[PDB]
Amino acid sequence: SNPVEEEAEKMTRNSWMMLDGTKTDFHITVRNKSLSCAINHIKIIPMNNIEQMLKPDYWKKMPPDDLYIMEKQLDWLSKSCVRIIKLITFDLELDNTAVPFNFTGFDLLIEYGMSATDESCIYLKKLSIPYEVTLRRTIEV
Amino acid sequence: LLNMRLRNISLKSEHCILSSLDFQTSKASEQLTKKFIYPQEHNSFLKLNFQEISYKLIDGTSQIELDPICPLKVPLTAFSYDSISATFKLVLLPKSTQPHRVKITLAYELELHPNLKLPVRTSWETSLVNSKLSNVKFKFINSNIKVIKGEKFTMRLQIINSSSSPLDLVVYYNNTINPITLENQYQLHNKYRKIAEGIILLSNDYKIPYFADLRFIGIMSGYYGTLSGLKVLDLNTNELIEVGNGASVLI
Secondary structure, three states, X not given: OOOOOOOOOOOOEEOOOOOOOEOOOOOOOOOOOOOOOOOOOOEOXXXXXXXXXXXXXXXXXXXXXXXXXXXXXXXXXOOOOEEOOOOOOOOOOEOOOOOOOOOOOOOOEOOEXXXXXXXXXXXXXXXXXXXXXXXXXXXOO | XXXXXXXXXXOOOOOOOEEEEEOOOOHHHHHHHHHHHOOOOOOOOOOEEXXXXXXXXXXXXXXXXXXXXXXXXXXXXXXXXXXXXXXXXXXXXXXXXXXXXXXXXXXXXXXXXXXXXXXXXXXXXXXXXXXXOOOOEEEEOOOOOEEOOOOOEXXXXXXXXXXXXXXXXXXXXXXXOOOOOHHHHHHHHHHHXXXXXXXXXXXXXXXXXXXXXXXXXXXXXOOEOOOOOOEEEOXXXXXXXOOOOOOEEOO
C-alpha cells in the first residue's frame, strides 16, 4: 500500500460591435478559503487568436488544402483563452469580446482559467467555464 | 453569564448574506453584581470590552465586520455589529468563531479579566422571470437601475428561447384602469390609476420576431416597483405572462 501526502492549496445575441463585460458572477476558484490571486487579471481580451487562425484559414484556402494547419481541428469555436495566474473568490476581468472580424462558422465559445497557488513547486489544477453566444448578421456585400 | 450574545442572519438574495451578532447586558446576571456593587457603593457595572472579533471558522480564517468599532465600555446596554458573509449557491453551511474580551472593573484596580468565544454555524436561512410553459426565460439586461427624469429611455428584454421557432410573440402595455374596506377600494384605485397612466411604451405592439429596446417616456413620478402592465402574448391561446421585474424611480 503505497501512499502519498495530502497537500492543501450564457451570453445572448451579438451584433458586429465590441461588447466589454466586467464579470463578477459566481466563479468557484476552488481553493481553501478567501483566495487572493496576488496578480490580478484586468482585461482577458478574447477573439484575437480566432482571427490569427482565420487569416491563415484564408491563406491556407489560397492554395490547395493538404492539412498544413487544417487537420480535423474544430478549435475555431473553442475560444480557449487561457487565463494564467500567479500564487472567498475574486471577480473576473474585463471581457472585451470584440467581434469585429470573425466568421459565422462558430456559434459557441469556451474558456479555461489556470487556478494557481504555487509554493516552491509546479502549477496546479485548472478550471474552465463555457459561454454560449449567437451572432447577428448585420450587413453583407 | 454576564452578557448574553445572539447572532441574527438575514438572507439578502440580491447581494451577500448579512449576519449580525448582538451583545447585551444579561439582566439576570447584572442584579447579582449590582447587589455587591451597591454594597461597595456603586450604581452600575463597568465592564470594558477591549477585543471583540469574529473569525471565519475553517481550518483557519478570519473576517472583518462591515463598519468601524472602537474599544468601548458600557454600564447596562447592548451593542450589535454586522459582518457580511458570501451568499452560497446550495448546501455549504459556513461557521464562525466570535471571540470577545470583557474586562471587569473595580476601584482603579482589581480588573478581573474575562474572555469568551462562542463558535457556531452562521446559517439561519429563515431576476429571471420564467415563462412557466416551455422555459422561455425573460430577464431585463438592466433591471432595477433607472433614474429617469421624465425623459425617454430604453431597456432590454433579453428573451431566451428553446431556439425552436424563435419568432412568436408581441409585447403591449395596456393603458386601461383595471376594474377592481372602502379605503381598500381607494388604495386599489390609486394603484391601478398610477399603473395605467404613468408611463406610455412608445413601441406598443412591437411584435418581436433575441433582444429588444422598448422605449418609454414616463409622464408621472414615483417609484414604480415591479412595472406592471407590460405583458406579452404568444402563439398559443393565452400566454399573457408578465415581466414582473424591473423598477424605475422617475425623479
